[PDB]
Amino acid sequence: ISVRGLAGVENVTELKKNFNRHLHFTLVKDRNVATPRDYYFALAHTVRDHLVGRWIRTQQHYYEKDPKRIYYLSLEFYMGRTLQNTMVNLALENACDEATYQLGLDMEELEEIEEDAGLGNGGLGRLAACFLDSMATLGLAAYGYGIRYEFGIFNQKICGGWQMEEADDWLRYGNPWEKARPEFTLPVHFYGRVEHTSQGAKWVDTQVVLAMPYDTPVPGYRNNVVNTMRLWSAKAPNDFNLKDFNVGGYIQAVLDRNLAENISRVLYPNDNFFEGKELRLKQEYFVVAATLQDIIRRFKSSKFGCRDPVRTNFDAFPDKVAIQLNDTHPSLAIPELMRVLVDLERLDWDKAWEVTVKTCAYTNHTVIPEALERWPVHLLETLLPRHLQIIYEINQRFLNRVAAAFPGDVDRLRRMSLVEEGAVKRINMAHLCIAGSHAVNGVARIHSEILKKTIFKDFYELEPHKFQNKTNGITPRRWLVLCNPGLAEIIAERIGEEYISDLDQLRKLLSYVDDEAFIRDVAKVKQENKLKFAAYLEREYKVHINPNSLFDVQVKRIHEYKRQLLNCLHVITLYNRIKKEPNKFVVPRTVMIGGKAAPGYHMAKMIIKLITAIGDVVNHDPVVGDRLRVIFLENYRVSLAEKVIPAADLSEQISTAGTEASGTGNMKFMLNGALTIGTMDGANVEMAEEAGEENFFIFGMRVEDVDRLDQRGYNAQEYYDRIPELRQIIEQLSSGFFSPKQPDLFKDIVNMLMHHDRFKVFADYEEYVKCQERVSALYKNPREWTRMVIRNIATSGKFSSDRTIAQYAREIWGVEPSRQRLPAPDEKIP
Amino acid sequence: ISVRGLAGVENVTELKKNFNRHLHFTLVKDRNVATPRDYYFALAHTVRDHLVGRWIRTQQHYYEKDPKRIYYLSLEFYMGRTLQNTMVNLALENACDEATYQLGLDMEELEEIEEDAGLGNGGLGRLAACFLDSMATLGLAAYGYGIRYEFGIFNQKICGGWQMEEADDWLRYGNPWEKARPEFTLPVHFYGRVEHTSQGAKWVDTQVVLAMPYDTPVPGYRNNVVNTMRLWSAKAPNDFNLKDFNVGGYIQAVLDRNLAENISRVLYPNDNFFEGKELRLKQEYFVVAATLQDIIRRFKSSKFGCRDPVRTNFDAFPDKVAIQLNDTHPSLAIPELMRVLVDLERLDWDKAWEVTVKTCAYTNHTVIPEALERWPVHLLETLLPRHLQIIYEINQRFLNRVAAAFPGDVDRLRRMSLVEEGAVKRINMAHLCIAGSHAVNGVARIHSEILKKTIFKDFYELEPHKFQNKTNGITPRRWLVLCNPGLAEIIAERIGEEYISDLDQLRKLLSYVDDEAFIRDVAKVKQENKLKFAAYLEREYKVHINPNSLFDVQVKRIHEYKRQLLNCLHVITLYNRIKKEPNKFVVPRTVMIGGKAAPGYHMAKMIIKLITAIGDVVNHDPVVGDRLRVIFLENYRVSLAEKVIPAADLSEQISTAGTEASGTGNMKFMLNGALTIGTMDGANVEMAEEAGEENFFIFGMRVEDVDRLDQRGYNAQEYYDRIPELRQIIEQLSSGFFSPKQPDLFKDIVNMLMHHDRFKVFADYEEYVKCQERVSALYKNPREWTRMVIRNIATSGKFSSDRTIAQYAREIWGVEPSRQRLPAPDEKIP
Ligand SMILES: O=c1[nH]cnc2c1ncn2[C@@H]1O[C@H](COP(=O)(O)O)[C@@H](O)[C@H]1O
Ligand SMILES: O=c1[nH]cnc2c1ncn2[C@@H]1O[C@H](COP(=O)(O)O)[C@@H](O)[C@H]1O
Ligand SMILES: OC[C@H]1O[C@H](O)[C@H](O)[C@@H](O)[C@@H]1O
Ligand SMILES: OC[C@H]1O[C@H](O)[C@H](O)[C@@H](O)[C@@H]1O
């Protein structure tokens, strides 16, 4: 059937009776009233049964051996569905496929019923999810820590071509994967004041919110390792949230509990954009506060909570603990670690600081100013009074370090300050993370260089040893084996299965680049993938596409820096050229653009409306026929990505050079048989460097050209004046050609493009359409297109998150990865 | 061990491995980190496994046979713990006791870990729970319908002698008994307006709240019948509760969902008191609206949703459906049934009314005015516009019926109106229930007569056939076998086990009233029970009591009509007599008073403080010694009742004659070996009539004497003037003898007792202490006390809820009870 494992006789029979056990005892249903949703749950429960045994021994193991623990703090974990991924990592897919088949059910139909765990916005949240899988696969004693939002990223609905947002009630039917652990509930404090008495400061008169943990298993790939992702939920204490007496109402007091519990109610839907709301800050401290108590409790036991030097010596803390900060969101971990060590454990400042800097490491994901977290001091002052005091003290001592290093450099002093003066005083969270971490890394080579040359230049000059790079990567399990079994199978037919956990082996496919059968096969799976997607399209969304055309797809969050608009300009250009010479042959294209816009991002929502507006015109022009279709992919999310990426021919990574930190979707397309048209931005540089620039479609300005233009001054009018095709498009938008009933509908876009384009869309236009002509030329030659595809796939090995994690482990965490199978799952009951 | 069933070889082994399966696969724990709470859950899950098989066939059976369905609507269901009760009804107790023992655990210790399902206030909510058990035991196709509150009756804490209320988060750790059924979610409407168009009225522009059901199994006693209790939970739709666009905030929209969901957040803690708040009314319509759709859906299928006359003829509706109204709380079921039939199904008014009156029946539980539900018309007008219209129309036609029956009786017309004029117009819910129900019943003989003679006299004259009586009862399973196995065992030793489901057989115990061994045994179990309680007291609450003293206990909700105050006066009298003649012998007594006061009931909370105040003085007077102790039983609830009742010697049922509708605690004490001191009120009359007045301690005014006094005019001063002992007590309270630091602390109580005593406490004082002297005299003669106890127990058979339910079934629902064992639980999978 494929290498989805063995469909053993004993195990298919075992699976079947357990499926029935759950359908009866767990779901309390009988075959006669069971719906596909019930069947999905019986299977999910049956599959989950297979990893609890491994989950329990993995955790018991770490307790016995007591290795260095890796804690990955993130406010986002973009998990997606977890049924197939668990089957794949446990080598259960074929057995389950067989068993359900015998039960008379279609496993694929049941898989579609599982709701996505959308606890993420985009790139940052998915990275965390890929990292978790790789850390388990590499046998690291790692823990994912975050917030269990009851409402994840909103479900996007397109009404009249406009995005409509609606609550993502992913828990509505229950989550069979998580395990509530109410017995490990921890208290978290807010507000209060600081009392300075005799021997130390005291955080007093605080409001208490409880953090209840929920553990979700994270299985490694076929190694019997099941790590844990612990997600905190907010709960109100039953005392003060009722007991603070003297009138108000008993009923109202109980109803008011949903004020402390709102902390974990919903994920902020912002991608690369900072919103300084109090609710956000509370979520940030809530995950940090609860997680640290857990980390310290685990350490206090270790082998110190037995003997060792005997005396809670936190000197070995950094040798047993490593906490990685996914962006500055969990940055309060630094002053919170200090608060506990100093105020509670009573260590001296310097010893505590040494310990803190040694266990914390920070990861930066963007260079755009509006994405940077700068919290107003009055907020920190009211909500976390002691943390502000600790931050001021950290700043004081850090700046003294700078003064001592750069005598007389008074401007450098204000530039590096953690405290920003001006309208309102703010705390620069990124400066905080650099100061309190022993390592700071970028997510791609050029982004990491940019950090040292620009944004964090002063900090780099102060401590050059802190700055590193760790190029992002994706997990080949979910992003290849799971979503593209057809391609995984033909690769395995030639080079084996060891590449799934050693992606570098794909290089061996280079010797099949002239193999006639392979070329035919690589081409065949892509055709099969396109056919399946084209079908899904009509199934769930309804209104035909042509599977013989070039599948041009750009899927990511809607942003001005990602330039979906530049893509739009090209689409309109194609349309106008066809209308000029209708009877001329052009390569057919289905351009698919999908992604979510943050609810308050006006420009982004206007761009979604433009895309659907273009589709309304292009898709109903009889002269165009089936040569050009414009489709907007609704509700782009992880599970939808698993469907489009394998069916894509062209991947669009066209951000303005210097703006996309790394990107990971680009990697997803490369490993799945799509050719890439993009700018020398983020990881695109390392990808083209790996496949060879000849097998990549690079165009536009490089970082240097962008800066040259900025020195000069960017004037869009110049481009409008010298390019008639561009002029024609802008006047079409301006006159209502794409919006008849509302002719001035797109004035904001035109106005922006002409007067305030921060990402110079027009400057790359000419080279972009020129370059697009070149991919069309190559698509006309199926054999050469596929051969170039093979060159990309065979050379994508470097972009596996296993490589990324191995580097973090060695160069930052100080732990060694291991592909050693844990001692089976085998029963056991001590 | 006892007749807690057989501890079979095959089943104890089967239980044990399943206990381990759950501890591993369900709880995801290993013996080395498992706590008693984990052990309780493994057992609970193991026990629950035994009734799902029976649950599924019982429901499938009712679908095949299609009998008349009984729907018990109540806003309260006081369930308590459900682990032991399930073991008892499934004959699993000994096997589970053995198995856990072999596993090295104490089953009794694990049972104490289960949280009570306190979805009730007192008498009314517990009746519903006893009814459910009896309906299952008598094989009726009955369904319990209500609201799944996430916070039940508050946990009572005594601080400085004052009650403190704190949220009852009973779901904190999960509920292993319920089964969420999100697939049967139903919409409920609120607000909107009424459009009158061409062919009918339309309820439009409403706000939608979703009702998600949760089913809990209700097993009959050893007959393999497992009925269902469906509890609704409020959920917000993900559309409009987000989709009603045009600014406000995406985040705020999501946080605002907890506004529609507040509907099922908390139970109103009022006992026999009406609070006209909007939240209450919304809960009342919410349970009614969701339940009726479910009832009609089930009917539409039946055998009509196959063939029959073919044409949705609702003429057979009353032949297939019976809905019982537990008080006026679910009274909107009447106008809601009309709304659906008329507005949606399009039946003519008269046919719909006929159907409605024929399927609905109402139960009245109290005669005090402040307990009566009178909803302001402006509230109904805004929240349920169409229902108000239907109510006005019902009133119109009903009053025409009256005018026609009593020509010219203009006052009778205003008296009977469903609409009350005055300050604000109100709708009298009770009048609504009488008009739209084919039966109206009281809960005890005297209460039912009072309804006909007083409160509902006019309605009785109009339709005498509607009014009935159904004396309350309690379930002998939870209230005997479960809480007092020792007494159940010795009864079974002489007359067998058939009495558990045929309590009348206890009469056979009358022939052992002179049996020396039985008397010794009856006396022994009571002594063992007292010893166990006296121990629990020191275990969980701490500060000694004497098990040789007479256990004088009054446990019920704190009310002015229950007269805990009259009990207080007696306690103080005993104390004063001892202090007058210290070296005189008096029968030792431990008087225990327990119960909760509604949060806003000032007088009730003042009474709790008086009780603890008396204890502070009495319990620390060296001259009193161990002859008199005053203890306040904290957090009185179902599980605590199972502990005190079996250990009680004297039961206090001293409400003012004519105020306690029936009472059920009185019955609980009678079946468990306690003698009763009380007034000729409620069921006390039927109990004394059953045991013989010679075996009952009756005192005070009868209903007639109370009325005579009211004609005359009640003057408390007269009693104060002629009784020196009474005078001495009031001056003690007035001068601060019981409150030194705050001498005027009890001025409200004294003031009330002297000038506004609605329940004439002083009028019964003399006869009450005189009567108390008589029980002390009899306690001094152990043999005669026990013989009288045997006369009570042997004669309590009439007070089983099986008898009550059999009467409802025959005289109201039109169904026949059946003690037929359903065809085993046996596997099966169609
Ligand atoms: O005190 C202990 N004794 C025995 N095993 C323990 C103890 N603490 C943790 N463990 C084991 O380690 C796993 C890790 O628990 P953690 O504290 O949540 O990391 C547990 O589920 C147990 O198997
Ligand atoms: O349409 C039907 N076909 C077969 N069995 C049904 C059907 N509707 C109800 N049942 C059975 O009746 C039980 C009662 O379901 P209810 O509608 O919730 O009362 C179900 O769990 C099924 O066993
Ligand atoms: O590092 C993970 C991702 O984080 C953010 O989404 C960045 O915009 C993206 O370039 C990066 O790939
Ligand atoms: O009918 C059930 C119970 O309802 C109420 O609590 C009444 O006050 C009580 O007398 C009655 O026994």
Tab-separated table of N, CA, C and O and ligand atoms in Angstrom, chain B residues 72 76 121-128 131 271-272 326-327 363-368 442-444 447 470 472-473 557 559 561-562 659-667 681-683 808, ligand 4:
chain	number	residue	atom	x	y	z
B	72	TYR	N	-39.483	14.605	33.603
B	72	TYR	CA	-39.500	15.319	34.874
B	72	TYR	C	-38.649	16.586	34.779
B	72	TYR	O	-37.422	16.537	34.852
B	76	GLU	N	-33.734	21.889	39.637
B	76	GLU	CA	-32.889	21.339	40.682
B	76	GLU	C	-32.876	19.823	40.729
B	76	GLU	O	-33.920	19.177	40.641
B	121	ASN	N	-30.937	22.913	46.227
B	121	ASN	CA	-30.901	23.724	47.437
B	121	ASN	C	-31.275	22.948	48.669
B	121	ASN	O	-30.630	23.065	49.698
B	122	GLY	N	-32.341	22.167	48.563
B	122	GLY	CA	-32.802	21.391	49.693
B	122	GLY	C	-33.879	20.392	49.328
B	122	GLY	O	-33.696	19.592	48.413
B	123	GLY	N	-35.006	20.460	50.034
B	123	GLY	CA	-36.114	19.534	49.830
B	123	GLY	C	-36.579	19.227	48.421
B	123	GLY	O	-36.729	18.063	48.047
B	124	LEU	N	-36.821	20.281	47.649
B	124	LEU	CA	-37.291	20.190	46.269
B	124	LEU	C	-36.284	19.493	45.343
B	124	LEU	O	-36.653	18.624	44.553
B	125	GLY	N	-35.013	19.864	45.451
B	125	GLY	CA	-33.993	19.252	44.611
B	125	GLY	C	-33.671	17.810	44.961
B	125	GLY	O	-33.315	17.026	44.082
B	126	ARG	N	-33.771	17.455	46.240
B	126	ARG	CA	-33.497	16.085	46.663
B	126	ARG	C	-34.656	15.195	46.256
B	126	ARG	O	-34.433	14.033	45.936
B	127	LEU	N	-35.884	15.726	46.279
B	127	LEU	CA	-37.067	14.935	45.901
B	127	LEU	C	-36.888	14.445	44.475
B	127	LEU	O	-37.106	13.274	44.163
B	128	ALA	N	-36.465	15.358	43.615
B	128	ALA	CA	-36.231	15.051	42.222
B	128	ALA	C	-35.230	13.908	42.085
B	128	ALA	O	-35.415	13.024	41.259
B	131	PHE	N	-36.842	10.719	43.210
B	131	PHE	CA	-37.826	10.328	42.225
B	131	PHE	C	-37.154	9.611	41.052
B	131	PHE	O	-37.634	8.584	40.580
B	271	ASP	N	-33.934	28.958	48.895
B	271	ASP	CA	-34.796	27.860	49.289
B	271	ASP	C	-36.099	28.489	49.752
B	271	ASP	O	-36.093	29.301	50.671
B	272	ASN	N	-37.204	28.134	49.104
B	272	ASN	CA	-38.507	28.666	49.469
B	272	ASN	C	-38.485	30.183	49.532
B	272	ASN	O	-38.916	30.782	50.520
B	326	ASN	N	-41.965	20.382	38.301
B	326	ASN	CA	-41.492	20.394	39.687
B	326	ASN	C	-41.517	21.865	40.079
B	326	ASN	O	-40.570	22.612	39.815
B	327	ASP	N	-42.626	22.263	40.700
B	327	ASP	CA	-42.870	23.635	41.115
B	327	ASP	C	-43.139	24.466	39.869
B	327	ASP	O	-43.254	23.926	38.773
B	363	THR	N	-46.776	20.298	40.266
B	363	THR	CA	-46.581	19.955	41.674
B	363	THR	C	-46.247	21.204	42.495
B	363	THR	O	-45.284	21.912	42.204
B	364	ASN	N	-47.054	21.466	43.522
B	364	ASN	CA	-46.843	22.610	44.403
B	364	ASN	C	-46.067	22.161	45.645
B	364	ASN	O	-46.356	21.107	46.217
B	365	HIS	N	-45.096	22.964	46.074
B	365	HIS	CA	-44.271	22.606	47.226
B	365	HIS	C	-44.341	23.532	48.448
B	365	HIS	O	-43.756	23.213	49.476
B	366	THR	N	-45.035	24.666	48.363
B	366	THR	CA	-45.093	25.577	49.515
B	366	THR	C	-46.280	26.513	49.485
B	366	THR	O	-46.825	26.776	48.421
B	367	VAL	N	-46.675	27.014	50.657
B	367	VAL	CA	-47.795	27.947	50.749
B	367	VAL	C	-47.393	29.341	51.196
B	367	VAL	O	-48.250	30.218	51.273
B	368	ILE	N	-46.112	29.560	51.496
B	368	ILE	CA	-45.694	30.895	51.922
B	368	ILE	C	-45.603	31.820	50.708
B	368	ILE	O	-45.012	31.477	49.683
B	442	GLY	N	-50.399	18.330	45.913
B	442	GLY	CA	-49.703	18.793	47.097
B	442	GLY	C	-48.710	17.688	47.401
B	442	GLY	O	-48.752	16.635	46.762
B	443	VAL	N	-47.835	17.890	48.379
B	443	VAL	CA	-46.810	16.894	48.683
B	443	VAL	C	-47.014	16.141	50.008
B	443	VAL	O	-46.188	15.324	50.432
B	444	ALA	N	-48.142	16.408	50.644
B	444	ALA	CA	-48.501	15.753	51.891
B	444	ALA	C	-49.996	15.998	52.051
B	444	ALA	O	-50.517	16.988	51.540
B	447	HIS	N	-51.097	19.528	53.495
B	447	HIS	CA	-50.688	20.591	52.577
B	447	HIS	C	-51.647	20.625	51.395
B	447	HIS	O	-52.056	21.701	50.951
B	470	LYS	N	-50.009	13.654	46.714
B	470	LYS	CA	-49.002	12.627	46.476
B	470	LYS	C	-47.995	12.892	47.561
B	470	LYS	O	-47.106	13.725	47.396
B	472	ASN	N	-44.903	12.874	49.689
B	472	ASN	CA	-43.515	12.664	49.330
B	472	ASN	C	-42.992	11.374	49.943
B	472	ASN	O	-43.651	10.734	50.770
B	473	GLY	N	-41.797	10.993	49.518
B	473	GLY	CA	-41.176	9.791	50.018
B	473	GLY	C	-39.697	9.913	49.737
B	473	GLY	O	-39.271	10.832	49.039
B	557	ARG	N	-32.424	23.463	55.715
B	557	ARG	CA	-32.035	24.828	55.383
B	557	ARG	C	-32.447	25.760	56.521
B	557	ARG	O	-33.443	25.507	57.199
B	559	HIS	N	-34.230	28.631	58.137
B	559	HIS	CA	-35.420	29.417	57.821
B	559	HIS	C	-36.112	29.889	59.091
B	559	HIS	O	-35.926	29.319	60.163
B	561	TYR	N	-39.347	29.847	59.332
B	561	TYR	CA	-40.469	28.917	59.478
B	561	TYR	C	-40.079	27.529	60.015
B	561	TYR	O	-40.923	26.824	60.587
B	562	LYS	N	-38.810	27.138	59.857
B	562	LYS	CA	-38.330	25.843	60.355
B	562	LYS	C	-38.078	25.955	61.858
B	562	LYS	O	-38.001	24.946	62.569
B	659	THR	N	-46.935	25.486	57.800
B	659	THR	CA	-45.873	26.077	56.974
B	659	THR	C	-44.955	25.127	56.181
B	659	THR	O	-44.483	25.481	55.095
B	660	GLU	N	-44.689	23.937	56.714
B	660	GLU	CA	-43.835	22.963	56.029
B	660	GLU	C	-44.748	22.081	55.176
B	660	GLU	O	-45.519	21.289	55.705
B	661	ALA	N	-44.660	22.230	53.857
B	661	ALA	CA	-45.492	21.465	52.925
B	661	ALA	C	-45.514	19.975	53.224
B	661	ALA	O	-46.586	19.354	53.277
B	662	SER	N	-44.327	19.407	53.406
B	662	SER	CA	-44.198	17.988	53.695
B	662	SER	C	-42.943	17.698	54.497
B	662	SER	O	-43.007	17.261	55.648
B	663	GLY	N	-41.797	17.964	53.882
B	663	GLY	CA	-40.535	17.681	54.527
B	663	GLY	C	-40.161	16.262	54.151
B	663	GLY	O	-41.033	15.439	53.888
B	664	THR	N	-38.872	15.962	54.103
B	664	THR	CA	-38.448	14.614	53.757
B	664	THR	C	-37.337	14.142	54.684
B	664	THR	O	-37.089	12.947	54.827
B	665	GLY	N	-36.681	15.097	55.333
B	665	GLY	CA	-35.621	14.764	56.260
B	665	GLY	C	-36.258	13.972	57.382
B	665	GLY	O	-35.669	13.021	57.897
B	666	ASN	N	-37.474	14.366	57.756
B	666	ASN	CA	-38.201	13.684	58.817
B	666	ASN	C	-38.319	12.191	58.511
B	666	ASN	O	-38.185	11.344	59.396
B	667	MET	N	-38.553	11.878	57.242
B	667	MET	CA	-38.679	10.502	56.803
B	667	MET	C	-37.319	9.829	56.885
B	667	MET	O	-37.202	8.690	57.326
B	681	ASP	N	-47.443	19.064	61.439
B	681	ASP	CA	-47.231	19.796	60.200
B	681	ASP	C	-46.735	18.853	59.105
B	681	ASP	O	-46.109	17.831	59.382
B	682	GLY	N	-47.023	19.200	57.857
B	682	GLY	CA	-46.559	18.387	56.749
B	682	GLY	C	-46.775	16.903	56.915
B	682	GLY	O	-47.789	16.470	57.452
B	683	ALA	N	-45.808	16.118	56.456
B	683	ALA	CA	-45.912	14.664	56.529
B	683	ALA	C	-45.818	14.119	57.956
B	683	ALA	O	-46.058	12.930	58.169
B	808	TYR	N	-48.055	8.501	41.222
B	808	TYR	CA	-47.959	9.509	40.167
B	808	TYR	C	-48.210	8.788	38.845
B	808	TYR	O	-48.976	9.250	37.991
C	4	LIG	O1	-41.658	18.478	48.245
C	4	LIG	C1	-40.267	18.638	48.465
C	4	LIG	C2	-39.981	19.663	49.493
C	4	LIG	O2	-40.035	20.927	48.816
C	4	LIG	C3	-39.769	22.075	49.654
C	4	LIG	O3	-38.429	22.018	50.067
C	4	LIG	C4	-40.743	22.136	50.859
C	4	LIG	O4	-40.409	23.183	51.718
C	4	LIG	C5	-40.744	20.793	51.653
C	4	LIG	O5	-41.747	20.755	52.684
C	4	LIG	C6	-40.988	19.611	50.700
C	4	LIG	O6	-40.821	18.405	51.432
